[PDB]
Design a protein around this nucleic acid. Structure first.
Ligand code: NA
Ligand code: NA
Length: 93
DNA sequence: AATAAGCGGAAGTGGG
DNA sequence: TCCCACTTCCGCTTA
């Protein structure tokens, strides 16, 4: 199954949920979620995964937190804002 | 308070 | 066996 960071990168590429997530500085890999519309995107992640429970933004962000140590996604010091690693961005493209 | 978000340990589930 | 890659639940903290 697809990994969370790849699900997010693919959404940013397609623009299919542009009201829920957007690039801040695409060259640096920084992106941000919508305060009001992030839950719809979290719901989509859970359905893509076939998880037992309904996915929430909180649970999705809890999963994102685990990428901080390995480096795929880091939290930026701004609400709802994250940054993909250069490895993630280059391999995706 | 109400609302929202952040922090993150610990235990549970998936598919190797 | 035992790690992967999260998921789920909980309690605390900050704005
Ligand atoms: Na445990
Ligand atoms: Na605030």
């Amino acid at each position: 199954k697809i990994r969370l960071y790849q699900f997010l990168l693919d959404l940013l590429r397609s623009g299919d949920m542009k009201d829920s997530i957007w690039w801040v500085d695409k060259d640096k890999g920084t992106f941000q979620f919508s305060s009001k519309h992030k839950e719809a995107l979290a719901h989509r992640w859970g359905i893509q995964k076939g998880n037992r429970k309904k996915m929430t933004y909180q649970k999705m962000a809890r999963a994102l937190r685990n990428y901080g140590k390995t480096g795929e996604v880091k939290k930026v010091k701004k609400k709802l804002t994250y940054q993909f690693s250069g490895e993630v961005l280059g391999r995706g493209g």
